């Protein structure tokens, strides 16, 4: 169509995306390592 202003696709080329550190799905709370005493 006949756009009246700048679009989002063209405008986002000037913007920084927020990036997370990689997420690991195999992480568990590991309660046993906290319940035990270490000598």
């Amino acid at each position: 169509n006949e756009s009246q202003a700048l679009g989002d696709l063209a405008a986002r080329q000037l913007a920084n995306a927020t990036k997370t550190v990689p997420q690991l799905s195999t992480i568990t709370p590991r309660f046993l390592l906290h319940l035990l005493s270490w000598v």
Partner: protein, 53 residues
């Protein structure tokens, strides 16, 4: 907070392909496994949507 309206979630692919070695007893001089952690090449990206009037 999202600084510019785009949020990218990076994820590890194939977590089962990271190889570790654990000895049960009488350790030997065998070579250790070599591995790395792989990432997804097309992570999901979230862009904020508007509610307005």
């Amino acid at each position: 907070p999202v600084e510019a309206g785009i949020y990218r979630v990076n994820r590890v692919v194939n977590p089962d392909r990271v190889a570790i070695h654990s000895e049960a007893g009488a350790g030997t001089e065998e070579p250790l496994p070599e591995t790395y952690v792989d990432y997804e090449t097309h992570p999901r990206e979230y862009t904020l949507r508007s509610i307005s009037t």
